[PDB]
């Protein structure tokens, strides 16, 4: 393998210890600490999941009874289960906030490539693990999730020759499927730790809390000066989350989304398809499937979202040609009388207003997409929510199209002002 | 030719003391001899912090925190100047809200309106008369 030149860092215990004992971190704010929160939540997820594994027997017909009985006879088991669920929630929250923050700072440059992609891959893997975890609940929610995943897997093969059997045996949750998925969940959850370590090592090459290049050269020593601040910011965000959850969720509630988790596989055969809803983090994808009734187009939308999320630095980056790359433009060619356009250069973050407007439109579209369930019972018979379609289409356009990111208007206007001023002053 | 460079080119060559125990006779090479190979990550993990920085005639002074305020420049002035005017108008609005108030407001209003239209269609579906 001569094509592979090498590795940025050799993750040996000696060198890792030295690197983390000599690491320096520049002064930062809370917005640039979501990565540490994600990593700490990953560590707690590892610990709590290890504790849970010693209680969960992978037989589907015993998981509900085992969970119910081992919460009483054993102390702290239900505490660890609650910690695991809330850790998944906070892990999704921190990961998406980190993604939004890194999209905001325009980290699609070439020097960020290794930092960016290594992160996205981790995120991608972090998705798969979550899916497997859901299956372990052995509720009707797990049944529906497994069925949808099996249908998506079988989509690639045109429904020929049961290529899904090695994992989704019969497309149903049984002893074999549960055992295999639980073991894969454990192994990939532990692999996520190594992936996160690799990403954290890579990203330190060019780390910035803000886009503006502060001239400071002195930096904090990571072990305690930065670590204490990271832990404190984690504490503050956890306090805020506790307050919001305490007030937004009354102790007894009516019509929660957990009501679909009543049905346990095996015990209850009939499924209340009227109220089918996943956890909020997988809510956007189920909403997309409901909005796009076409199976192939929905699968393509999911794959495109994830992969374009992976390939941001390539579409929007400098591309090593130093902004001499030529785009393909539909209509601007007529206005400029040129087939192609040189990539614009001045695309700062804090200063320009177009970038902020587009980014916040994208973020609000994502929030609206996760805001509710389209309720496919008559979501199409009734003309569907136009806001959901607008938000999905803007998400697709923002990720992939370079006219909403690095727009040409700013560069042309700045050059016009430059030309006018130089002509006036010669 | 029998020359190191073959007699027609110059070779930047160096015999590393790594993998060698003795300088000569029976005395060991210095423990940190390998560090004398500049610009190699293998030499030290300190080379990862290698951003461009050059200076001449530059002096900076730093003081021990033991001689400095535990909480410096806290509540200088009143609540109005330190909190209402600085942390809210200059830190929350000038930096954060001034940037996203318009797009967030537009998206929020549009989502509210679209959800209301969707709910009204749902009502028409469920309720007649």
């Amino acid at each position: 393998m001569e094509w592979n030149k090498g590795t940025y860092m050799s993750t040996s215990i000696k060198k890792i210890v030295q690197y983390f004992s000599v690491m320096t971190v520049s002064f930062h704010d809370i917005n640039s600490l979501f990565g540490f929160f994600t990593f700490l939540t990953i560590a707690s997820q590892l610990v709590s999941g290890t504790m849970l594994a010693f209680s969960l027997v992978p037989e589907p017909m015993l998981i509900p009874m085992v969970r119910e009985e081992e919460d009483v006879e054993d102390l702290y088991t239900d505490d660890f289960f609650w910690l695991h669920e809330r850790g998944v929630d906070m892990l999704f929250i921190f990961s998406y906030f980190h993604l939004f923050r890194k999209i905001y700072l325009n980290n699609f440059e070439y020097e960020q490539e290794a930092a960016w992609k290594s992160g996205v891959f981790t995120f991608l893997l972090f998705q798969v693990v979550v899916f497997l975890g859901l299956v372990l609940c052995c509720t009707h929610l797990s049944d529906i999730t497994l069925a949808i995943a099996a249908n998506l897997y079988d989509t690639f093969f045109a429904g020929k020759g049961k290529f899904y059997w090695w994992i989704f045996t019969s497309k149903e949750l049984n002893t074999d499927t549960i055992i295999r998925l639980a073991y894969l969940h454990y192994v990939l959850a532990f692999f996520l730790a190594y992936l996160g370590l690799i990403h954290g090592v890579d990203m330190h090459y060019d780390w910035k809390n803000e886009s503006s290049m502060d001239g400071l050269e002195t930096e904090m020593i990571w072990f305690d000066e930065a670590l204490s601040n990271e832990l404190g910011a984690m504490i503050e965000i956890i306090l805020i989350v506790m307050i919001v959850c305490f007030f937004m969720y009354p102790e007894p509630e009516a019509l929660s989304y957990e009501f679909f988790m009543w049905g346990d596989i095996g015990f209850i055969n009939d499924v209340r398809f009227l109220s089918v809803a996943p956890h909020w983090y997988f809510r956007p994808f189920m909403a997309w499937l409901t909005v796009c009734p076409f199976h192939k187009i929905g699968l393509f939308g999911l794959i495109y979202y994830f992969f374009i999320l992976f390939y941001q630095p390539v579409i929007h980056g400098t591309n090593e040609q130093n902004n001499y790359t030529k785009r393909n433009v539909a209509f601007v060619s007529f206005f400029i009388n040129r087939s192609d356009i040189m990539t614009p250069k001045y695309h700062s973050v804090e200063d320009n207003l177009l970038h902020q407007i587009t980014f916040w439109l994208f973020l609000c579209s994502a929030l609206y997409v996760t805001s509710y369930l389209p309720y496919g019972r008559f979501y199409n018979r009734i003309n569907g929510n136009y806001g959901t379609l607008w938000s999905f289409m803007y998400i697709f356009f923002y990720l992939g199209n370079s006219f909403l990111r690095r727009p040409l208007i700013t560069e042309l206007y700045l050059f016009n002002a430059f030309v006018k001023s130089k002509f006036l002053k010669k | 030719m029998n020359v190191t460079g073959a007699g027609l080119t110059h070779v930047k060559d160096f015999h590393s003391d790594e993998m060698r125990v003795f300088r000569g006779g029976l005395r060991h090479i210095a423990d940190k001899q390998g560090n004398l190979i500049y610009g190699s990550v293998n030499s030290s993990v300190r080379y990862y912090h290698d951003k461009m920085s050059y200076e001449r005639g530059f002096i900076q002074h730093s003081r021990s925190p033991s001689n400095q305020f535990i909480n410096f420049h806290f509540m200088l002035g009143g609540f109005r100047t330190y909190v209402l005017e600085r942390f809210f108008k200059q830190v929350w609005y000038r930096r954060n809200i001034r940037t996203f108030w318009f797009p967030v407001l537009i998206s929020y209003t549009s989502g509210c309106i679209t959800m209301r239209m969707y709910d009204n269609n749902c009502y028409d579906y469920f309720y007649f008369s």
Binding site: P252, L255, S256, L274, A277, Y372 | G111, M115, R116
Partner: peptide
Amino acid sequence: FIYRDDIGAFWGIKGYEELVTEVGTHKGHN
């Protein structure tokens, strides 16, 4: 973002529209 309060879905949770579900929690406090 804003969910109508007479559809029969509490806080936007669709389904359960053939039931009386808001009694004691949202309308009335047992």
